[PDB]
Design a protein around this nucleic acid. Structure first.
Ligand SMILES: [Zn+2]
Ligand SMILES: [Zn+2]
Length: 51
DNA sequence: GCCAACGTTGGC
DNA sequence: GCCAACGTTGGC
């Protein structure tokens, strides 16, 4: 399998804008990570199978 | 080829 | 167990 996709239906997924104040917003360049308020609740769970 | 952002690792 | 850094890659 490949990388998982956002679920689109949890609160973080339904969020319209980045929060602007978390570690990932402030350091967008070094982290490569989505805003911590936008991270999908499903994707915070570790994979059922590796790649 | 770019870019948003997942997967994995490892330092704490 | 948490979380930042890096390499990566799906979609464009
Ligand atoms: Zn944020
Ligand atoms: Zn979600």
């Amino acid at each position: 399998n490949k990388k998982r996709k956002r679920c689109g239906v949890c609160v973080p997924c339904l969020r319209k804008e980045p929060c602007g104040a978390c570690y990932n917003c402030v350091n967008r360049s070094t982290s490569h990570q989505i805003c911590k308020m936008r991270k999908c609740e499903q994707l915070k769970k570790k994979r059922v199978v590796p790649m």
